[PDB]
Amino acid sequence: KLFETSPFDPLTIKNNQDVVDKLYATQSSSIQEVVPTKTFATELQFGVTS
Amino acid sequence: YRPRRFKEIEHTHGYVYRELNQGSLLPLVDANLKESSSYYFKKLMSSISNV
Amino acid sequence: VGRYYNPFNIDPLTKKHVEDRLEEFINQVQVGRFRNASGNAVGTTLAAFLRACRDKTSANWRGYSVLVSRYRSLIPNELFESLRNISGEYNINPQDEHSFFFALAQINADDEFIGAIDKESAEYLDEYATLARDISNSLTLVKAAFGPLERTSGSIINHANNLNKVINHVFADKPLISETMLKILTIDGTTGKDGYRNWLD
Amino acid sequence: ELIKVPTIPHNLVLIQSDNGKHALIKEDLGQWPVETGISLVNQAGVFAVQLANKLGIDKPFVLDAGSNYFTDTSFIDTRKYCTDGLSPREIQKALNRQRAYYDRPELTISENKTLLSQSIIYPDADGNDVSIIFSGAMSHAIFTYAQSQWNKNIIKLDDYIREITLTVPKQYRPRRFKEIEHTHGYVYRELNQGSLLPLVDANLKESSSYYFKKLMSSISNVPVDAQHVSMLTNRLTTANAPTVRAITVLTCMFKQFRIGMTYALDPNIMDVAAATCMLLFRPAQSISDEQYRYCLQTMAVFLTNTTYDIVNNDTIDVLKMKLRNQGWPFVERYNAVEIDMSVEPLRSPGQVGRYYNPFNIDPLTKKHVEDRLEEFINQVQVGRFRNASGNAVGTTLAAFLRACRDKTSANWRGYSVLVSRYRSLIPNELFESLRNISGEYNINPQDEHSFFFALAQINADDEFIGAIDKESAEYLDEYATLARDISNSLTLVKAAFGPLERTSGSIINHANNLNKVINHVFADKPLISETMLKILTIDGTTGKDGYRNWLDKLVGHNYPVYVEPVVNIMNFISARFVADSSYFGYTNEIMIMPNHINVPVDDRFGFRDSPFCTSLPRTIMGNDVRRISYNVFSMMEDIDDVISEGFILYDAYFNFSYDIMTTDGVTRLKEDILIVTDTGNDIKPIHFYIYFENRNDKKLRYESKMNVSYRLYIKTPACLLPLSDYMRAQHDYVSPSSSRVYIKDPAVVYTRS
Amino acid sequence: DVPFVQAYSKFADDNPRHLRVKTGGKMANALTNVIRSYYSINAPAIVPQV
């Protein structure tokens, strides 16, 4: 078997976004370069609304 | 190394169907393996029994 | 044939660390005063843990050197050449690294080898030849059954996904064709629409 | 102990036919299976120990067969007839039965006396008694060789004493042996000292920690006799006195045992007192250059009222000049004076031992090695320190220095005796090799000053001296066991392992072979004693793991290993196993020929269709006999054509057995010669049924020509010997004199008690 | 042929193919031209420092 758990099922995706979301869901099965944690933001602006 | 002999009937009148195509792994190999490498490495580590 | 780095920077010819002044360095740290001109016990604590790391490294380097060889023997040449193109960097927490060398388990791997032959690794490499036969068999059968493909409407992702469903229906008596094509698309489809285009190519 | 062997293992049998025409002498050393495809010498070594066990020559022994004799009834005989060996009566009966078949007269009285007097026991000039008996050639050669090897270690009692005279101290009472033991006393001693360095050099940290702990567990049990000034009185303590006492002995017992002191972050008048005491009353060899600076820096910080930052970059000379200008003269470390031991140390043949005299006191002068001590104390008393007009610091430091000087000058002899006794426990190599790699015995500044200020007299009572005598025997036992373990491990590494390359195959081969050795070594009774396991498990690793790493290090060693007698005995037997294969039931080649081909065979034993030949024929019918290796023969598919002509199978080891039958019959093999399968050919086990021959039996002659179609031939075993050559079985064994007493405890002194 | 293939890989930095003649690769090319440069001044000396 090439993978213990497949990265994603190709028959379920419909666009590029679906692949990205599926890859994030199955990333726990793979050996990760950096294990995700809470993100840290150094840049934030709020624009005026309607 | 040598193959073991069959029965005498099979040597005189025996026939076998064989396919000589060996194939290639390139279609599976030829890709951008960047994202699938991590998943394949996890399966690789599990193949050998772990202490 | 191939090459791999020996784990833990140990030269097998000398059976020691590559640095020949390592023992002298550890003694120098022990007597050294650090963080303050008066001793803070930093030198004694660091030298004690560094000696333990070296002793565990020297005792347990043979098992890891054998382990890396066994893992390398599971990879076909075509797959290894592809992995040479990719690159990456692994981030390790400082607590995990120190705990790894301090509590370094020993890998025996003695019962795996019958003489100089590893049955499990030899048999695992062989099933790739069966996979290679299936890949060529499936690819040619789909090309003959479907011919050139034209997309009048719909997206590339929709084009490939529905084609795989038709392949399963047409070759239902031969389930291997659908499975093999899905294996290629799973590897190809990670990139996204570009990978789907590569699959159709 | 030295065992005594009463009887000689002749290992001989006599086989004669029913009609008596044919008889032979066979030496039965057993049957030993040999496996092909692997080294023969390694299998020979395993069988060599079992062979030595059978002959009773594995353990040190001395032969006593002198009393195995009887005297004839004749008046003029006055000869001793040996009981051991094959009795001449059996040879007489066999020879008489042979003469009956040929209708010859029986052995006359003259020849009967000559035959029955062949085995005799006679004394030689040296007093030993020599036994001449009938025995096998290999049994004689192996037994006599093992006798020579063990005899090298048997020496006279006076010679043994002369070797151990230099090691005997003066406190112990001499031992009076009996007058017989002086004239006829012999001992069995190895008299070879193996080096302890291979264990010590490989594991300096573990070995040093083991010996330091063992010594300190005993020195700490020694019986003992029971404002700035306010600051140093408060820091005074005694709870750690036993520990500091033993550290003091260890520094003076070893060549280089370095200790360190960790001062406080803010130096106090406590810190300067501790620095002065260590620099004055401790050996310069035990003080490192770094500790010399750190002690000097602490003095400068407090006396000159300067913080550590400025003095951190100062060298030794700069610090000394800065301290001397302020008024501090104690800036030098002093070398101790070495006292030579009265006797040669243990495991140090022809070597002189020495130890440092405690507290830096010259034995000839009986005061401190520094001749300006009184002048220096005066300067401290009148000096001005801490950049203050007051002299409180100067006067109080001089008071403590005077107290420390007085305390050391009065208690120095007691510590010198303690160091002298404990120095005798360790050999010379440990004295020069052991180092304090790990700083596990650091001394607190309060402990250092309180130890010297409150020095107590060492009381050496009878109980403490008696306790050390028990430890001396224990230490001597431990060193002997480790030397044997080191020698065994050094021999195992050379025979088993080899060099390592940068190839994955070499690493895998080394790892697997190493695990097999460790598993076999630790199975059943372990090869390594518990003393070596304690040393290798000091860090925390298990016994199996600790031994495994040491074996890896020893690979490629150039350490010389002494060749003990039991090495030579096994080596001698292994050489004879390979050289004389037919004695042990295996051969290197066999011949398969059809019946109609006439081959020259051995005809001395009178066998019907004898399967033995003097040597396998080089040519038959004018052409050289074809030779095929076993591996080629196994893969042959045209074997039916090949066996028609006949060939010789070689490149393999063939195990065979034979049963000589007294009656007459067809000489045949128990099973078929070969087995033919699809996956190769093979030769079935060889078992011969050899029968003695009556030439005029027409029935058995026709069966041999017709019933059997193929015959197997091997080289004639050398254990077989015709009866007519029974004088070739006469062999000589020498037993030492009966007027020898063997001393089990060769110690030359008694405990004082 | 494993020991020779392994040694040739270190010398020439390539695993040989069956049809292509084995000559040593870049190491053989550099060594041959440097030998010429030593013999005479007139030699081209065309080996880069990299």
If you compute the radius of gyration of chain A from its CA atoms, what whole number of angstroms results?
16
Angle between the N-to-C axes of helices D445-453 and D269-281, in degrees from 0 to 180, rounded to the nearest 10: 60
CA atoms within 13 A on the CB side of B30: 9
If you compute the radius of gyration of chain E from its CA atoms, what whole number of angstroms results?
14
Q: What is the resolution of this structure in A?
A: 2.6
Q: Interior CA angle at C20 toward C15 and C24, to 5°?
A: 120
Give the closest residue to D21 by CA, choosing from D79, D86, D103, D80.
Answer: D103
Q: Please report, for chain C, how many H helices and E strands are present, in that order.
A: 9, 4
Q: Which residues of chain E lie closer than 8 angstroms to C1, CB-CB?
A: 2, 5-6, 9, 15
- Chains C, E: CB contacts within 8 A come to 5
Token pair recorded at residue D431: 């004295």
Q: Does residue D420 contact residue D191 with C-beta atoms inside 8 Å?
A: no
Determine the Cα–Cα distance for residues D536 and D549; give it in Å rounded to an integer: 9
- Start-to-end CA span in chain E (Å): 32
Pairing of strands D612-613, D710-715: parallel
Are chains A and D in contact at 3+ CB pairs closer than 8 Å?
A: no
Q: Does residue D634 contact residue D655 with C-beta atoms inside 8 Å?
A: no
Determine the Cα–Cα distance for residues D216 and D244; give it in Å rounded to an integer: 10
The one-character DSSP state at D692 is B
- Chains C, D: CB contacts within 8 A come to 74
Match 């580590």 to its residue by tokens: B45
Token pair recorded at residue C175: 């389930």
Determine the Cα–Cα distance for residues C56 and C104; give it in Å rounded to an integer: 6
Q: Does residue D515 contact residue C28 with C-beta atoms inside 8 Å?
A: no
Q: Does residue D712 contact residue D649 with C-beta atoms inside 8 Å?
A: no
Determine the Cα–Cα distance for residues C119 and D102; give it in Å rounded to an integer: 71
Alpha helices in D500-542 (DSSP H): 504-521, 530-536
Nearest to B43 among A2, A23, A26 (CB): A2
Helix H or strand E segment including D450: helix D445-453
Determine the Cα–Cα distance for residues D57 and C169; give it in Å rounded to an integer: 84
Determine the Cα–Cα distance for residues D256 and D433; give it in Å rounded to an integer: 8
Inspect the interface and report whether the beta carbons of B40 and A2 lie closer than 8 Å: yes
Q: Does residue D238 contact residue D275 with C-beta atoms inside 8 Å?
A: no
Residues 6+ apart with CB under 8 A from D266: none
Q: Which residues of chain B lie closer than 8 angstroms to A27, CB-CB?
A: 38
DSSP per position, C80-101:
HHHHTT--------HHHHHHHH
Alpha helices in D191-337 (DSSP H): 197-202, 204-219, 228-234, 241-253, 269-281, 289-303, 308-311, 316-326
Determine the Cα–Cα distance for residues B8 and B14; give it in Å rounded to an integer: 9
Alpha helices in D671-751 (DSSP H): 698-706
Determine the Cα–Cα distance for residues C158 and C154; give it in Å rounded to an integer: 6
Are chains E and B in contact at 3+ CB pairs closer than 8 Å?
A: no
If you compute the radius of gyration of chain C from its CA atoms, what whole number of angstroms results?
27
Q: Does residue D288 contact residue D258 with C-beta atoms inside 8 Å?
A: yes
Give the closest residue to D487 by CA, choosing from D375, D433, D602, D566.
Answer: D566
Which region, left, alpha or beta, applies to residue D78 given φ > 0 means left and ψ of -120 to 50 means alpha? left
Inspect the interface and report whether the beta carbons of B4 and D635 lie closer than 8 Å: no
- D683-688 contacts, C-beta under 8 A, 24 or more apart: D683/D590, D683/D630, D683/D649, D683/D654, D685/D655, D686/D590, D686/D654, D686/D655, D686/D656, D686/D657, D686/D712, D686/D714, D687/D656, D687/D657, D687/D658, D687/D659, D688/D611, D688/D656, D688/D657, D688/D658, D688/D659
Q: Interior CA angle at D535 toward D533 and D536, to 5°?
A: 65
Give the closest residue to D25 by CA, choosing from D35, D42, D38, D13.
Answer: D13
- Environment class of D423 (CB within 10 Å of its CB; exposed 0-12, middle 13-18, buried 19+): buried
Give the closest residue to D143 by CA, choosing from D45, D126, D67, D151.
Answer: D151
Q: What's the gap in Å between the CA of C163 and the closest CA on chain E?
A: 39
Token pair recorded at residue D312: 């951190």
Determine the Cα–Cα distance for residues D171 and D154; give it in Å rounded to an integer: 29
**Buried (b) or exposed (e) across C157-167, using 16+ Cβ within 10 A?**
bebbbebbeeb
Are chains C and B in contact at 3+ CB pairs closer than 8 Å?
A: yes
| Nearest C-alpha in C relative to B31 | C188
Q: Does residue D353 contact residue D272 with C-beta atoms inside 8 Å?
A: no
Determine the Cα–Cα distance for residues D40 and D24; give it in Å rounded to an integer: 31
Determine the Cα–Cα distance for residues D515 and D98; give it in Å rounded to an integer: 61
Pairing of strands C16-17, D3-5: unpaired
Pairing of strands D69-71, D741-742: unpaired
Q: Does residue D565 contact residue D61 with C-beta atoms inside 8 Å?
A: no
Determine the Cα–Cα distance for residues D544 and D541; give it in Å rounded to an integer: 8
Q: Does residue D719 contact residue D586 with C-beta atoms inside 8 Å?
A: no
- Start-to-end CA span in chain D (Å): 28
DSSP per position, chain B:
--PPP--HHHHHH-----------SHHHHSS-TTTHHHHHHHHHHHHSPP-
CA atoms within 13 A on the CB side of D145: 20
To test the contact with chain A by mutation, choose from C187, C198, C200 the residue with the greatest count of A C-beta atoms within 10 A, namely C187
- Environment class of D130 (CB within 10 Å of its CB; exposed 0-12, middle 13-18, buried 19+): middle
Q: What experimental approach yielded this model?
A: cryo-EM
| Nearest C-alpha in E relative to C3 | E6
Give the closest residue to D211 by CA, choosing from D452, D464, D426.
Answer: D426
Inspect the interface and report whether the beta carbons of C161 and A11 lie closer than 8 Å: yes
Which region, left, alpha or beta, applies to residue D349 given φ > 0 means left and ψ of -120 to 50 means alpha? beta
If you compute the radius of gyration of chain D from its CA atoms, what whole number of angstroms results?
40
Neighbours of D397 (CB within 10 A): 24
Distances (CA, A) of D409 to D414, D455, D460, D519: 11, 11, 18, 59
Instruction: Identify the three-state secondary structure at position D628.
Output: strand
Which residues make beta-bridge pairs with D123? D129
Q: Does residue D142 contact residue D47 with C-beta atoms inside 8 Å?
A: no
Determine the Cα–Cα distance for residues D649 and D681; give it in Å rounded to an integer: 13
Inspect the interface and report whether the beta carbons of A8 and C186 lie closer than 8 Å: yes
Determine the Cα–Cα distance for residues D204 and D536; give it in Å rounded to an integer: 11
Determine the Cα–Cα distance for residues D286 and D251; give it in Å rounded to an integer: 6
Token pair recorded at residue D377: 């104390």
Determine the Cα–Cα distance for residues D532 and D530; give it in Å rounded to an integer: 6
Q: Which residues of chain A lie closer than 8 angstroms to B42, CB-CB?
A: 3-4, 29-31
Match 């002690």 to its residue by tokens: D295
Q: Does residue B35 contact residue C194 with C-beta atoms inside 8 Å?
A: no
SS3 assignment for D327-382: CCCCCCCCCCCEEECCCCCCCCCCCCCEEECHHHECCCCCCECCCCHHHHHHHHHH
Determine the Cα–Cα distance for residues C183 and C134; give it in Å rounded to an integer: 11
Neighbours of D314 (CB within 10 A): 16
Residues 6+ apart with CB under 8 A from D51: D29, D30, D142, D573, D577
Determine the Cα–Cα distance for residues D172 and D170; give it in Å rounded to an integer: 6
SS3 assignment for D458-502: ECCCHHHHHHHHHHHHHHHHHHHHHHHHHHHHHHHHHHHCCCCCC
The one-character DSSP state at C167 is H
Pairing of strands D185-188, D741-742: parallel
Q: Does residue D280 contact residue D330 with C-beta atoms inside 8 Å?
A: yes
